[PDB]
């Protein structure tokens, strides 16, 4: 729900930002239309075309105000003031970004070290694309297919899954994709018994 | 001490319009009591001169339409400086004045008449008075940029990264 | 085509398969490159859909970070859509990519709007979209059709605006 | 008029890019991150170009005097005229400006040659020193 709230907030914020920006184009499209009608026709919105025949903006001349110490030094030190504020906000945003990056990054080094020191060597290993997920996951070929077995029903392929809850490693076979639970070990544990 | 800019400054005089009403005849009379009317302008000097004497495209159209405007030239040509003159009028609600200053350069070698130079823009809309577009554009753009910054920082907060997938939401 | 001698095969009025007269269509390097890239990616998508029928990643191709990455994506596209039997297409695509004045679709649309707002000939418009000229006289000499047809101030304004529109690499 | 014409075309393409990013954000499903970055960077650099070009032609924009058309009727379109001819910031920008003045301690109508001027001179030198220091640091290690 907070994601929906923030998405609506950013939508309305960008709409507010663009509403004032539209008026700039509305006021400035008039000059070319006055100078050249045909080029200017398309610039304005249909409502503004209906409002008036566009010849609105015409060139005019006004002199530049006489300069003095009074406003430039105040303006440039006021701009120094605004850019010192931008530097402050720059440092603060960079600090927040680096704190977030450091925390997350050390988290994935924690998981990374768990993966590195949890994996042994063991058998023939590759990457496969999951039928359901479509991503790349590690898989191990354990089957006797290369050992001379003619059993075509099963390929002896087990996908490696890092257990989120226990931070351990588990093997999921290809064939038994129906049992989805923690009781897989006992549900699949079969045996051969000889009775005399 | 905080001052509201005179460009956005808007004066309302309900008593004057109630007593006299809005007309081109007294539009300058309506403007007289406003803060925008400088007391150092030659128009006020002409006003006291008249008072003492009594006690003792559309520019050419409005030129030829009114005789008091004539009297305005024949009383204003003698005095050079900051003066208030009408720009255009469309009845019964719209009037705009022309804010210009005159320097009657009568020096030898200049065949042109007195120099007329603009100073300000004033628009009389109804009973209200209005007085840079560059500032408007920059203000709109900067507020848009502020809103964009807020939206983008929120979106970056929403962003979450994982090494094995990339960035997702 | 110094004297706009386009011949019968390339007349301004074209007769389509529907029998209606149409304006002759001319595209510069950017427009032609974008059109051919769009056609190739659409054909690749159709091929993938057909293969899925018989039996995400495409967003990264159109949006290229750099020229070299764009060229690598172009090579992959040609390998997966053309078969490598057409060297002339590869040479034309490389020439388009190396000397494409404009990479973004919106900027190309801006250039098209600026050039064809005046209503010039499609040949002249495409030439101006292909050639970047510093001065109006340079374009007028290098484009003899533009002589006597466009004012020098307008040509200078168009050229300066186009030079400003060029996206920095 | 040429400067305002260039201002117009560039502002129009900027508004077109804003409309673009708007109608690709308005979708109920968010596209890939990379497309959003590309759109952001393009539109934002375009805003930079807008600012730079607005900065270049300040004199042409200042010389132009605004006047309503004789044919334009104000009696019926006074609301539209007053929509365009008023130009104050949003209040959250002016209160942000006042909070920035208060937080920085900056105020620019009474400043004179005493302590603030010796602080102003003592600030120039840190920038130059840091620039020279980082030039030296870059030169210390071969980066090619």
């Amino acid at each position: 729900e907070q994601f929906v709230k923030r998405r609506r907030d950013m939508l309305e914020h960008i709409n507010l930002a663009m509403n004032e920006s539209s008026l700039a184009l509305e006021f400035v499209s008039l000059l070319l239309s006055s100078v050249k009608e045909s080029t200017g026709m398309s610039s304005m919105s249909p409502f503004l075309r209906k409002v008036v025949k566009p010849s609105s903006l015409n060139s005019d001349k006004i002199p530049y105000v006489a300069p003095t110490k009074k406003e430039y030094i105040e303006l440039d030190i006021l701009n120094k003031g605004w850019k010192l504020q931008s530097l402050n906000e720059s440092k603060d945003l960079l600090r927040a970004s680096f704190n977030k990056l450091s925390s997350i990054l050390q988290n994935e080094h924690d998981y990374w070290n768990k993966i590195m020191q949890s994996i042994s060597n063991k058998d023939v290993i590759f990457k496969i694309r999951d039928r359901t997920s479509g991503q790349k996951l590690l898989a191990i070929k354990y089957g006797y297919e290369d050992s001379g077995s003619t059993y075509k029903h099963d390929r002896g392929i087990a996908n490696i899954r890092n257990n989120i809850e226990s931070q351990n490693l588990d093997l999921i076979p290809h064939s038994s994709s129906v049992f989805k639970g923690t009781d897989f070990v006992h549900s699949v544990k079969k045996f051969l018994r000889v009775r005399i | 001490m905080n001052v509201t800019p005179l460009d956005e400054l808007q004066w309302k005089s309900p008593e004057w319009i109630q007593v006299f009403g809005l007309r081109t005849e007294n539009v300058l009379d309506y403007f007289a009591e406003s803060p925008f009317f400088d007391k150092t302008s030659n128009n006020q000097v002409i006003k006291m001169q008249r008072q003492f004497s009594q006690l003792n495209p559309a520019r050419r159209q409005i030129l030829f339409k009114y005789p008091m405007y004539m009297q305005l030239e024949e009383e204003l040509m003698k005095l050079d400086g900051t003066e208030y003159v009408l720009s255009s009028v469309r009845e019964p609600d719209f009037w705009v004045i022309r804010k210009q200053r005159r320097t009657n350069n009568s020096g030898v070698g200049s065949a042109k008449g007195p120099e007329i130079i603009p100073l300000q823009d004033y628009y009389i809309i109804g009973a209200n008075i209005y007085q840079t577009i560059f500032k408007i554009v920059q203000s709109r753009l900067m507020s848009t940029s502020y809103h964009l910054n807020s939206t983008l920082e929120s979106l970056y907060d929403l962003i979450e990264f994982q090494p094995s997938q990339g960035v997702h939401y | 085509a110094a004297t706009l001698q386009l011949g019968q095969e390339f007349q301004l009025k074209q007769i389509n398969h529907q029998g209606e007269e149409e304006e002759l269509i001319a595209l510069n390097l950017s427009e032609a490159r974008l059109v051919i890239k769009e056609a190739l990616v659409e054909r690749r998508r159709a091929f993938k859909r057909s293969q899925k029928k018989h039996k995400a990643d495409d967003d990264d191709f159109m949006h290229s970070e750099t020229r070299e990455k764009e060229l690598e994506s172009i090579d992959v596209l040609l390998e997966q859509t053309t078969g490598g039997n057409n060297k002339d297409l590869k040479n034309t695509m490389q020439y388009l990519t190396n000397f494409s004045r404009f990479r973004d679709q919106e900027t190309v649309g801006a250039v098209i709007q600026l050039l064809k707002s005046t209503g010039l000939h499609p040949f002249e418009v495409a030439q101006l979209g292909s050639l970047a000229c510093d001065t109006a006289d340079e374009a007028k000499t290098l484009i003899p059709s533009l002589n006597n047809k466009i004012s020098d101030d307008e040509l200078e304004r168009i050229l300066k605006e186009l030079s400003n529109l060029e996206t920095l690499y | 008029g040429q400067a305002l014409d260039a201002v117009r075309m560039r502002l129009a393409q900027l508004t077109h890019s804003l409309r673009r990013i708007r109608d690709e954000m308005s979708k109920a499903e968010l596209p890939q991150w990379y497309t959003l970055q590309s759109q952001l960077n393009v539109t934002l650099s375009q805003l930079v170009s807008v600012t730079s070009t607005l900065q270049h032609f300040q004199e042409t924009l200042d010389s132009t005097v605004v006047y309503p058309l004789p044919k334009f009727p104000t009696t019926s379109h006074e609301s539209l005229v007053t929509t365009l001819l008023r130009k104050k910031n949003i209040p959250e920008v002016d209160e942000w400006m006042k909070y920035v003045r208060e937080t920085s301690g900056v105020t620019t109508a009474l400043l004179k040659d005493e302590e603030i001027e010796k602080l102003l001179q003592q600030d120039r030198e840190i920038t130059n020193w840091a620039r020279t220091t980082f030039r030296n640091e870059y030169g210390k290690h071969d980066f090619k």
Binding site: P46 | Q10 | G109, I112, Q113 | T82
Partner: peptide, 25 residues
């Protein structure tokens, strides 16, 4: 020509922030 015109983005609902103060005589 012109690929597409701009959609009308008028905001009459905007309340405006015109400061009104010199009303008293």
């Amino acid at each position: 020509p012109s690929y597409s015109p701009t959609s009308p983005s008028y905001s009459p609902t905007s309340p405006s922030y015109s400061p009104t103060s010199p009303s008293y005589s």
